[PDB]
Design an enzyme around this catalytic site. Structure first.
Site, PDB file in Angstrom:
ATOM      1  N   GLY A  84       0.814  -1.197   0.000  1.00 11.40           N
ATOM      2  CA  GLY A  84       0.000   0.000   0.000  1.00 11.40           C
ATOM      3  C   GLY A  84       0.851   1.251   0.000  1.00 11.40           C
ATOM      4  O   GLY A  84       1.754   1.390  -0.827  1.00 11.40           O
ATOM      5  N   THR A  87       1.840   5.246  -0.499  1.00 11.40           N
ATOM      6  CA  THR A  87       1.652   6.124  -1.648  1.00 11.40           C
ATOM      7  C   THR A  87       1.816   5.361  -2.956  1.00 11.40           C
ATOM      8  O   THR A  87       0.979   5.468  -3.856  1.00 11.40           O
ATOM      9  CB  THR A  87       2.638   7.294  -1.585  1.00 11.40           C
ATOM     10  N   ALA A  88       2.866   4.547  -3.065  1.00 13.17           N
ATOM     11  CA  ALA A  88       3.122   3.855  -4.323  1.00 13.17           C
ATOM     12  C   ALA A  88       1.970   2.925  -4.674  1.00 13.17           C
ATOM     13  O   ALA A  88       1.479   2.928  -5.810  1.00 13.17           O
ATOM     14  CB  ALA A  88       4.436   3.075  -4.242  1.00 13.17           C
ATOM     15  N   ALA A 138      -0.836  -5.441   4.257  1.00 21.45           N
ATOM     16  CA  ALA A 138      -1.049  -5.812   5.645  1.00 21.45           C
ATOM     17  C   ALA A 138      -1.352  -4.567   6.481  1.00 21.45           C
ATOM     18  O   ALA A 138      -0.843  -3.480   6.199  1.00 21.45           O
ATOM     19  CB  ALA A 138       0.181  -6.522   6.195  1.00 21.45           C
ATOM     20  N   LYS A 183       3.986  24.942  -0.637  1.00 16.97           N
ATOM     21  CA  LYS A 183       5.430  24.926  -0.840  1.00 16.97           C
ATOM     22  C   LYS A 183       5.759  25.735  -2.084  1.00 16.97           C
ATOM     23  O   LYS A 183       5.405  25.334  -3.198  1.00 16.97           O
ATOM     24  CB  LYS A 183       5.951  23.499  -1.003  1.00 16.97           C
TER      25      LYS A 183
END
Lengths: 520, 530
Positions: free
Chosen positions: B19, B21-22, B45, B85
């Protein structure tokens, strides 16, 4: 400190290369440098171009499009139309009939290729072709410009509102004369009408001056070689080797003339034609009242007289009453375009046959790069090297693209067409073909001169030539198998092309009528 | 009678391992790209997020990812305590000594700070403003720093003002700071509830492979067998599919970047007293650097260091002293990096994304960019069950070029730092620059632009023109590396120099105008988040 600035630029040669260089540097250097053109006192066979000529050159000089067009009998160009490149036999201006009833023609237009789901329309067309869902030709399916050209309609309305993208046909000698007048009368460029008799060089091998027959010794700090194929500065004086690239392109000669044309009866075609011949091809470049024409050929497969006879037969010309212009080409490029204080521009730098109308582009691209890399008297090797790199990449990329026109022609009916298939493709274009054969786009477009210069031949251009000649991907773009909504969106795009062609063919003026309004 | 067309040999199931971000960026993006023709499974998991939340990004995140999914910017920002930013601010990269959040004074009187903003650099006569600045600097006609002379954003950042007005009118370009764990959970919910992605909450116990080395299924601890036709490795540094199962070699690139570890935490922040900085800070340390990533109420911070020149305890002490933290009473997250990239990102039917594919320290905030760039390229090169080697090869070529180009740019941050005060900063100078960046430095040194941009503002266009002239000038000139002489063409263009003087005056006027009219970053954040 020290003043290492260039004070004088000497340009050897006139013509388009010499006077484009002089006018462009006249603007770029803001009257801080003396500019000298050494040109000895000297048929309108016509020249075709590509769409960035106005933005990249004439707009830079502040010369309106209509102003220079009216001085060089200019006309409008929406494409190159390739005729009889797929079928055997003697040259004819009329296309032969394919087995499916269609004529042997395909267009390479300047119009933009739309996209759906970031995938170009070409790929939705190719998928349907490979899946048996269409037999339509690529140019008819994907460009409204094709319908406009078939009707010989103009790329602008009579009120001059733009309708499509386009480039120009013109008399190149008149363009050179127009730019000479501009440079001499508005930019104080010095025109020396004399013959060069000696190139003087110092112990470092830098040119110091050009001696002339009348006795002038023309001092300069930077020298631009616009002397043509002889390369009297870059090749002869600087001894820079020329790289013959006849192992990629076989044609090396041309015979040309200008043919009076009944514009009222036939109208005016808004395109350049490339008419396949037995030992090369013949260009047709329409202007008001006449078209320029030239048979490009390989003198290893036809003698000059044979090509001239075939050229004359193509148009029904009487050889005893027709004035012909003959040229022997030098195909390839210098090892380095800029050596010490000598920068080569035009045919002194590099040349390919005008199969995609790139000759004037090579000139103003090089001049743009010279101004970007403009040196001082120290001639920083990095400036010189970066300029040289841009020229070699520009040239080799177009060289490869032209070779593909021949390498993927299905013709095998003459020694010339068979000989092309025994040549080897350079690695760069072999890679592009492999990408194309996998169904992937080839150099997607990115839409500033930089951006265009670095994305010159893009996916649409490769599809026009590959698919026009009959080279297809091995299979559809695999991602399309997962995108039913995007396929549907592309169907709307195909319908937009049909509707746009219908609408513009109905509303546009003929090219003939627009030209008569432009030129009076 | 079937027609036997290629469109019948399609991938039917995609299994994503991991899981974060990727994994959830991949699942959400493919959920959109494949238009419900493919079953998508994510094996993740249950985990607990680690201390030190905060990640910085670059400006195309919204256009290239969230806009593609149709998620409005403010919607996802509100779900991950996101902030704004405008740049990375580099502090003390030119001067010696222990790490400090406060800049040291250079020999020229200016503080040791320089900005790398996202703002656009204007041009005169097709020449970027950077080159008119460099000419005056080298000719003794100005002492002003590049970032102050050429970007109004610098003045905005110095005042801590926001890149948008309270009515949400844009004032400057900008990217985002956010809690990456919350971003992933947001995308998990989106993929499961709006795209019918299946979330399998379990651990992988075995990778099943056929005789040709293609993965056939992932076995899980519960005993379920997740069959699939294409597998995306989002398992992180362990590369459990691409490295362990497929045995694809990893190319360590510690011969270009020495840092290989981080110690991080989250620091509560008095926003009312101090305001909120609209930028990421990169604070030079004796054996690396420390990031500062502000969000509402706290900033994430992490000391990236090379364990060849500092032990974990040494780095932890220096990191804690930087912020005045009690090392024995502070929760830290310690991480060991894998710096480099796989020999090939995609092997047979296994595509690696994120840290399983490649990694560099977050010195230019490229980590999430590498993810959605890879996903965009996977969708472009998406295969059928024949896995055409040309598609795989073209995908791999894009990843290796994307990575090596950013690797080179990062190495230059160290190689051209003038610091020689510790073994770490001296050691960087003994490394070699790759040919590609040496060529760019040589171009810069002759006064020429380095990769002029192709827009005055398409993912392809930006992907092929990622680090451009402005970026190279920010870092090179920021660190003190200057051209050997001005762009020679400027000696012939007095009208263009005059035109550029007007541009310099515009920069001052725009910055002055905006500093007065803009809201504080803090006030914009309070409105955005309630």
């Amino acid at each position: 400190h020290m003043d290492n600035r260039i004070k004088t630029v000497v340009i050897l040669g006139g013509g388009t290369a010499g006077w484009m260089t002089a006018a462009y540097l006249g603007k770029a250097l803001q009257n801080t440098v003396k500019i000298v053109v050494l040109e000895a006192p000297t048929i309108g066979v016509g020249e075709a171009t590509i769409p960035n000529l106005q933005r990249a050159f004439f707009d830079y000089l502040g010369i309106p499009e209509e102003e220079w067009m009216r001085e060089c009998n200019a006309s409008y160009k929406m494409a190159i139309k390739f005729i009889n490149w797929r079928t055997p036999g003697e040259g004819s201006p009329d296309p032969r009939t394919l087995d499916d009833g269609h004529t042997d023609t395909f267009h390479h237009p300047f119009g933009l290729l739309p996209s759906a789901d970031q995938i170009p329309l070409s790929h939705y067309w190719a998928a349907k072709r490979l899946q048996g869902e269409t037999d339509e030709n690529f140019d008819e399916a994907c460009f409204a410009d094709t319908a406009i050209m078939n009707a010989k309609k103009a790329p602008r309305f009579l009120d001059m509102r733009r309708a499509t993208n386009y480039a120009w046909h013109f008399d190149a000698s008149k363009v050179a004369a127009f730019l000479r007048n501009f440079a001499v009368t508005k930019q104080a460029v010095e025109h020396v009408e004399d013959e060069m008799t000696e190139v003087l060089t110092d112990e470092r091998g830098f040119i110091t001056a050009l001696r002339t027959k009348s006795g002038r010794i023309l001092q300069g700090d930077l020298f631009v070689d616009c002397s043509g194929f002889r390369g009297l500065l870059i090749n002869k004086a600087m001894e820079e080797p020329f790289i013959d690239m006849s192992d990629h392109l076989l044609c090396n000669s041309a015979v040309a003339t200008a043919v009076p044309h009944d514009d009222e009866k036939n109208g005016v075609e808004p395109y350049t034609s490339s008419i396949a011949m037995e030992a090369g091809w013949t260009w047709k470049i329409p202007m008001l009242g006449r078209f320029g024409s030239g048979h490009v050929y390989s003198d290893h497969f036809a003698t000059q007289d044979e090509a001239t006879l075939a050229f004359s037969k193509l148009w029904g010309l009487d050889p005893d009453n027709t004035e012909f212009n003959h040229v022997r080409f030098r195909v390839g490029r210098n090892r380095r375009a800029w050596v010490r204080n000598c920068v080569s521009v035009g045919l002194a730098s590099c040349f390919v046959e005008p199969l995609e109308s790139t000759g004037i582009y090579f000139i103003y691209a090089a001049i743009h790069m010279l101004a970007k890399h403009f040196p001082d008297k120290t001639f920083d090797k990095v400036l010189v090297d970066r300029f040289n790199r841009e020229i070699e990449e520009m040239f080799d990329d177009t060289r490869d693209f032209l070779q593909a026109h021949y390498y993927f022609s299905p013709r095998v009916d003459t020694p010339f067409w068979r000989a092309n298939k025994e040549l080897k493709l350079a690695d760069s274009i072999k890679d592009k073909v492999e990408t194309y054969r996998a169904g992937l786009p080839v150099n997607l477009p990115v839409t500033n001169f930089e951006a265009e210069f670095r994305n010159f031949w893009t996916n649409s251009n490769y599809y026009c030539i590959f698919a026009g000649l009959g080279l297809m991907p091995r299979n559809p773009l695999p991602a399309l198998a997962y995108k039913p909504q995007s396929i549907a969106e592309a169907e709307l795009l195909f319908a937009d092309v049909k509707r746009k062609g219908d609408t513009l063919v109905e509303s546009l003026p003929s090219t003939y009528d627009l030209l008569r309004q432009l030129h009076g």
